[PDB]
Amino acid sequence: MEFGSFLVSLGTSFVIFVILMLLFTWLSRKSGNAPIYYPNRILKGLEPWEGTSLTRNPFAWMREALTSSEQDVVNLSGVDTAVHFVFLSTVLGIFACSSLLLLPTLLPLAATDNNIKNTKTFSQLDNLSMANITKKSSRLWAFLGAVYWISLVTYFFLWKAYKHVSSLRAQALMSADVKPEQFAILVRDMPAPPDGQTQKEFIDSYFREIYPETFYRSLVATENSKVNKIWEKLEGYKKKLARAEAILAATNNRPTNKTGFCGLVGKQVDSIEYYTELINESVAKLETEQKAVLAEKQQTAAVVFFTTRVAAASAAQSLHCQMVDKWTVTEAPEPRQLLWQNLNIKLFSRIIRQYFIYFFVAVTILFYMIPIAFVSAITTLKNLQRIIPFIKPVVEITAIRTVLESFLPQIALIVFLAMLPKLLLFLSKAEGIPSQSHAIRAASGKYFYFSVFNVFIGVTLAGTLFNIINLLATSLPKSATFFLTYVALKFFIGYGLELSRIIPLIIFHLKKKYLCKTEAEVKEAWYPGDLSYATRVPGDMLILTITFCYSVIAPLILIFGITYFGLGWLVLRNQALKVYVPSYESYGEMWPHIHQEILAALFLFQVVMFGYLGAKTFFYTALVIPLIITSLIFGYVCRQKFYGGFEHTALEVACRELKQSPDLEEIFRAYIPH
Amino acid sequence: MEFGSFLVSLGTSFVIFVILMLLFTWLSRKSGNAPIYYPNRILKGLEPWEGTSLTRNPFAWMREALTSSEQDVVNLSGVDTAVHFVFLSTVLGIFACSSLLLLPTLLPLAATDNNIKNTKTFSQLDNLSMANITKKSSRLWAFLGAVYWISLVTYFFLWKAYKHVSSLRAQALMSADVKPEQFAILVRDMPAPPDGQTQKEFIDSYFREIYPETFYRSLVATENSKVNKIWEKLEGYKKKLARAEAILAATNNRPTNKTGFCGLVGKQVDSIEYYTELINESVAKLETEQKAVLAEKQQTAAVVFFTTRVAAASAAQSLHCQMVDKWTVTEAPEPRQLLWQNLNIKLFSRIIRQYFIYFFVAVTILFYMIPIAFVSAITTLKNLQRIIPFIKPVVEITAIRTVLESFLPQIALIVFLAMLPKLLLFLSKAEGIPSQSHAIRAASGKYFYFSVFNVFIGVTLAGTLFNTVKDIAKNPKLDMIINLLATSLPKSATFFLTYVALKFFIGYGLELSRIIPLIIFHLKKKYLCKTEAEVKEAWYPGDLSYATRVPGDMLILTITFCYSVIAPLILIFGITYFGLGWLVLRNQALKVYVPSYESYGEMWPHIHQEILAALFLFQVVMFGYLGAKTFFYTALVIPLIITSLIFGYVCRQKFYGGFEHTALEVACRELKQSPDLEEIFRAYIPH
């Protein structure tokens, strides 16, 4: 019955994906939906291209995507998205070459043997797996050569893509213009000022010693939580007064508000004047607090500004005081990336929080594994049928009952998986990470480990429970069925939902028609947001992890991986061409993390291949040990070969970049939060 | 080992030690011995002993040693020897506290138990060890408490020591004079000029852009291997001609050289005229070659000199080109430390050589595992008797087997572990290491791997098998474990007692008495050698030789952590080893040895990493043992291992970053005094 289960799930996913595709064709063909299907190119208003109206058969939206050079993507969005695209491209290339060799040689090899049905059918695809292969068979040699070739191919593609990303980084850095993050460093962990002088007088006359005639200013970090809170309160008050003024300018007859707190407690009489007195009182209070904070709440973190890229880039890898405890220095993140909150955290606090968060993550795997499986089994009562509701017995088809009992576990799992990334991002920022990009990358790494351990081990154990030498052997083929479902579920809808973009489109065209969106305020009406690498990269790493897991056992997941990453390349190329706009520009710094994962997945599932063929019990599984040690060798040689360039900007892309006498004053007041 | 061999080895070591001490204290009172027992304070003339006719002979030097502060050693020998001394002192403190708690509360527990008689031979040393503890005994709880306490004590002393060494390094760097290694970097792994243009024209006009008005000159590392050969040969000719003319002046008889048979017995040629014509020809050839190679024989390594310490120190941690394959930059070593041949090794070549050397190190790990098995076979000759009865005729009388047991295995171990360090230092120098200090510390690390694996594992396991392999006729899985483990481990513990005793007694007697370099002296003078004064190179003492001292010391440290619990008689031997080492090496450093390089304490983090590696590995050993003793302490040592890893990471994160570089305070606020910057140059010239 499992055969029918994933057959039906695949059919439903394909059908609904087709539905959303047709909707996309229907919706995007209208000019009224341009802001939701072309948020980009409206900002920096490149006039979203329509040309002729319709012919409806050819040339819909493909020529725009497939004819986009990496230079075009970098110019239009940035060099960061092109890194994600080269990640997708190298994964696609690995899987394409792997399929082109594996499948024509392993499909017939698996077809001929009949070990399954001899150890005494469940499903036909079970014949096309490394389970219909007899014990002590010569086909073990072909299988081992296959995994060996997989390792060789992925090594080659990783090296090529990593050279390419290093070249793209060196190209983007060298041609950049004057940016405020090129003249600053982020000094943390300073001692208390000696006797009476405040922190500002201490930071100065210290850097003014080390760096005479090449030091400009210092923006000491101050606890401003009160200043923040009152500031967004005042900004929201100004926004409300502005929308009220626009309403007045429209109707010229001040309407009546729903008098009260959320329309419950109060008298809204000429609310314009209420908000006016509120905002001016808030301005006075904010002025007083802003004056107060700059003199008393002066903490132990400070951005430091130099006068030349040479000095700033050189005074960011150097060690300033002969104790790693004090005056720790790193390159200042760009203003859009500084987390003023997570500064001020001393080194010991950073270490202790790092290990407490990692331990809490491990406890998260544990309290996921046992308790959430327990409560999911509890939800099975709601899943099948409940006596208490008086639902009319009209359904009467068991097939969709099976569909529901397949979805509900997956639905709950996905709900908690979507609860994850916010929690992991919040935890990542709790180690005191001083930049948004590093926080997002650490969250992605934590989610990757969680996903691998959790999903892989849990589904493997579930397969073992369903069905010691045959323990690792027989169990894995059945687990492929579950992944064939879940991969497929995330396969169609997620790419379908993003491409169709109906979920933002449902929110749009309704926030405008209803009481919301009185004034134009179109910018935040349809602001797209980032690519949110907190959810793209770890999900694609999970798909890659599964594909390299069953890369050899059941070489039918390879075609699913290829089609997944091909559709991802296509849809995300279209999106980055027309939809998203980045909020931070990390110049491809992300990608070494992706390289380390990819290699970690390859290492882990070379180990899995070793163990699984050891379950096949032939004295040649030791041949995997050279592959494991080779993965270690490749990791170290890559680390020393490229990783240096991805942490800093070398003193050529900073020195001879030919600045044009920067004012150094608009570089300042660019890190000012106020 | 049985009682006779252990006792006779201890007695022989003690008697030779006291003989050497008596010889030293008697023979140090002779003025002629000054440049032997006081090489230092003769160089840098200081009137070695102040006064007349030093009394208190056994303490004439001991009193002069216990009253010397770390500041005195730093001012007299250097800031590197003081690091070795804090290493010795902290190991001594760890083992002192460990003894003060372990011994009184652990030894009686082993003494009162009677796991012995389970044999259905040994020593009383085995009775005062783990083997005497029965199965599932409450005393193993005390033993677990003991290992937990020793781990805590080591953590405490390591942290305190590492703060102290960081303080010493800061105090030394902050007050050092104008030394040429502070203004320079070692620019290595360059590309080639893609035109008609010499390499030096390319190193310039490139750094002149990155560091304008703060870039002074740049030596390109010209390959001079054959130039070096001709220069050393010329200097040998100079020395030999000086010897000949000194002989002629001292005897007024025309010297005659019979060149042939390695220049000893051959064709008779007139000495000084031959040497003069040959030396002038050699000078002409040398200067022609130097002119021909200082230009146009360029390669892809260089040394760069800035003008201010701030720029020089800042532009050494930085990254120069946006590809780490090009313009690799590291802080320049001292001119005395640079290995000019190891430059001109591109990054891939360096990695390939590193990996080949590591693999060869593993192969020779096995090839030394073999004679370690031989040693562990020899040490238990009685059990070796029942196997291979070919040794029955030779092992008949008490005395012969006694002397073999007492001497031979220790001598074999010494021979192997003393031939090894030269090989390891040569191997490390082939990894493209660009300095002498890094090569020495890498050789020390490889020696630590050899020590741990071969010595510890091989000796203990070979003794285990050869004490049990012939008694595994029956195969009860539960039963063979206990017999194997208990009847095995304390035997290796006793052998290591003997070995460590041999080391501290004989080695420190030889070092303190210094007779071997003294027999070379007083004989290289009275015989044909040492005709001219030339005293300086006749008794030049040399370094502390950290390539051979720290390795052996860490081997003894690992052994003491071996049987700090299993057989807590090792603890006394380790304490006395390190105490005698402290005392003797103090006397040496204050008076005898003078270093050739100054690393400003960069070597101690490696020492800390080893020490913690030993602690980790033998928390693991205790975990395996208590758990092969059949009780559930298994979960009581995993927390110790986890906290060991956390301690390692925390120490690396808090202090290690301060050892690799000199901060930009000791560089700026060092208050320069108008450095010449020209005599700073031509101090890195290879000649």
From Swiss-Prot, chain B:
Molecular function GO terms recorded: calcium-activated cation channel activity; mechanosensitive monoatomic ion channel activity; mRNA binding
Annotated phenotype, changing Y449I: In 1.1.ver mutant; promotes activation
Keywords noted in UniProt: Calcium, Coiled coil, Ion channel, Ion transport, Membrane, Transmembrane, Transmembrane helix, Transport
Highest taxon in the source lineage: Eukaryota
InterPro entries reported for this sequence: Csc1-like, CSC1/OSCA1-like_7TM, CSC1/OSCA1-like_cyt, Csc1/OSCA1-like_N
Membrane-traversing stretches: 5-25, 86-108, 139-161, 350-376, 403-430, 440-463, 489-520, 546-565, 567-585, 604-627, 633-653
Chain segments annotated as coiled-coil in the UniProt record: 232-300
Record note on quaternary structure: Homodimer.
Name the UniProt record assigns to this protein: Hyperosmolality-gated Ca2+ permeable channel 3.1
Organism: Arabidopsis thaliana
Gene from which this protein is expressed: OSCA3.1
